[PDB]
Amino acid sequence: GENEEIIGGTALEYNVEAGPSKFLIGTESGSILTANKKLKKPVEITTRYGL
Amino acid sequence: RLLKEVKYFLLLRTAKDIYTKAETYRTQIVALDMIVDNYNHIK
């Protein structure tokens, strides 16, 4: 939206079955954000977990 | 600790001019540090 707050990520989860495309990140607030690497755009936070 | 302390408070929900020259103080210290290292080696 228009409200942006930077929250430190305390956990990073990467798996071969998941592959390089999906990266799992856990924020300081407690929510989990998934970042998908794209050739077309540098980074996309495709899914927000337990918002 | 005080600077890192303030950021955590934001996450959990006339001093501006001083905080504004916080950015200037950091640049000056890095520049001052380089000459000090150079000035001590010769000494």
Length of chain B: 43
The residues near A29 (Cβ < 8 Å, ≥ 6 apart) are: A7, B11
Interface probe with A: pick from B4, B10, B11, B13, most Cβ of A within 10 Å = B11
Asked if A14 and A23 touch (Cβ cutoff 8 Å), the reply is yes
CA distance A25 to A16: 16
CA distance B11 to A6: 8
List the resolution, Å.
30.3
CA distance B5 to A43: 29
CB atoms within 10 A of CB A41: 8
Elucidated via: cryo-EM
The residues near A51 (Cβ < 8 Å, ≥ 6 apart) are: A31
- Using the Cβ of A5 and the Cβ atoms of chain B, whether some distance falls under 8 Å is answered with yes
